[PDB]
Amino acid sequence: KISLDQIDLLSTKSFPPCMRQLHKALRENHHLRHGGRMQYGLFLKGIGLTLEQALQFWKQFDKGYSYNIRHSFDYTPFSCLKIILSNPPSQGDYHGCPFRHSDPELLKQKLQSYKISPGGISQILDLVKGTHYQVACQKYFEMIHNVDDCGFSLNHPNQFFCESQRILNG
Amino acid sequence: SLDQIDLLSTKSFPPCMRQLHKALRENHHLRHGGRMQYGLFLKGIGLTLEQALQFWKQESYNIRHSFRTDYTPFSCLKIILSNPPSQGDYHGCPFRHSDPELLKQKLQSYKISPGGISQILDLVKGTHYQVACQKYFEMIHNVDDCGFSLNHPNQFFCESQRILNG
Ligand code: SF4
Ligand code: SF4
């Protein structure tokens, strides 16, 4: 067992926006609805981690849940197209793809909170207007890693993670 | 404690780290080059290799979840191009540093098919060490194309974990 706050830095450095938002929502709300638990949990599964949900003894608003991580040593982790094209999030949901599912003004605010430069935000929003969600995410990747070219064709959040970790490990 | 990742090593470690895990299990020790290569690889997956000491004794390897020094894991080119292993050293890259006959025997013990071993040895003879390792990856995971360009052992591990948990 491992605390869920241990991967805060990893989430900011290597998670794609779809999983970064879900980690943040889990940390702040102490719970995710089923759509988020599936998207984020299966993403963690693809890295070799087991998300675990627990109910606290004092639960008879705070729903009384506690989430943690455990290192793993038959649900398939979601691809980009599955996240973008299926299961659009309702108002209680934090899952989905921010480039496809966030209102553009809210998306701009979100990218600003991520410290993306104004030019990068402009390029990303341009790509979003063309419905090129994964290309916009490749742009996000390039901005957050300070590289000119991501060097791969993005089609999976876990692929995003592996390529980010490759860059970070030299 | 280290025996827990034997299976993990057979399924997800690249040959360079699989050989170091085997050597640690069998010799109960690694020299500094091997400890660095393997330990930094393990740190990158979230594990801390350490030796146990009794605190009450006045002046055995295990692993623990990681939870002061540069922990950056070695890349393929750093392993391949520097620190060639001496006898007694188990570090390095098997595609670059193992005699081809020993590499073929090792791949046989890894249950690679004869045709796959032939492909790998052809690539090694051309000095395409990372491409040979990509081919190894494709064989042990039964996939047509690995779908990535390999230049880091921890990247090998990450893509393997994607497939095994896919
Ligand atoms: S493009 Fe793919 S990886 Fe990027 S945020 Fe959208 S679903 Fe996630
Ligand atoms: S090519 Fe890289 S990952 Fe593969 S065995 Fe050699 S050093 Fe390890």
Nearest to B162 among A72, A73, A158 (CB): A158
Residue A67: left (phi > 0), alpha (psi -120 to 50), or beta? beta
| Structure-token pair, residue B55 | 């605190």
Is A48 part of the contact surface with chain B (CB cutoff 8 Å)?
yes
A39, A50, A141, B69 from A20: Cα distances, Å: 11, 17, 13, 28
B43, B68, B124 from B74: Cα distances, Å: 11, 18, 21
For residue A16, the CA-to-ligand 1 centroid distance in Å is 6
The CA distance from A145 to A133, in Å, is 18
Closest residue in A to B44 (Cα) is A169
**Cβ-based burial of A63 (10 A; exposed 0-12, middle 13-18, buried ≥19):** exposed
Query: Which residues does A146 contact at the CB level (< 8 Å), separation at least 6?
Result: none
Give the method of determination.
X-ray
Give the total number of structural domains in chain A. Answer: 1
Please name the residue whose Cα sits nearest to atom 4 of ligand 1: A137
| Structure-token pair, residue A133 | 């969600």
Closest to A14 in 3D by CA, of A49, A52, A38:
A49
What is the domain extent for residue A99? 1-170
B146 is in an annotated binding site: no
Partners of residue B77 in chain A, C-beta under 8 Å: none
Query: Which residues does A97 contact at the CB level (< 8 Å), separation at least 6?
Result: A17, A18, A80, A83, A84, A133, A137
Please name the residue whose Cα sits nearest to atom 7 of ligand 1: A80
As beta bridge partners, residue A65 has: A55
Is B83 part of the contact surface with chain A (CB cutoff 8 Å)?
no
Q: Are B103 and B85 in contact (CB under 8 A)?
A: no
Closest to B163 in 3D by CA, of A60, A122, A46, A111:
A46
This PDB structure is determined at a resolution in Å of: 2.0
Return phi, psi of residue B121, to 5°: -65, -35
